């Protein structure tokens, strides 16, 4: 029974860490969207400029 209990003890603290970490990561991707629109604008501009 002690063996069963021990696995769960270590989990209880560390899982709270991942829970936070995952949501923290999701925030970073929001900011990545801002980059994506920047990437697009440049590409379009370069293409027209190439045509010119």
């Amino acid at each position: 029974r002690i063996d069963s209990v021990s696995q769960l003890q270590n989990v209880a603290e560390t899982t709270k860490v991942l829970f936070d970490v995952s949501k923290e990561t999701v925030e970073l991707e929001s900011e990545a969207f801002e980059l994506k629109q920047k990437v697009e604008l440049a590409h379009e501009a370069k293409a027209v400029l190439d045509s010119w």
Partner: protein, 62 residues
């Protein structure tokens, strides 16, 4: 001699051939702007999801 004759004739009688910037525009891709700045939708906003999740998965860790 002939060099001079050609040089003179060529340069003088037409330097450049006609060109128009307006005509160029049709044949090249025009700049067009990206549509929407966009804002990401508020993902899993509020405890509506949480209350649902706690109930939905009350699943223990074995």
């Amino acid at each position: 001699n002939v060099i001079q004759d050609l040089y003179l004739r060529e340069l003088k009688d037409t330097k450049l051939a006609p060109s128009t910037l307006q005509d160029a525009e049709g044949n090249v891709k025009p700049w067009n702007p990206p549509q929407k700045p966009n804002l990401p939708e508020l993902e899993l906003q509020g405890p509506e999801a949480l209350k649902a999740y706690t109930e939905q998965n009350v699943e223990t860790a074995h």
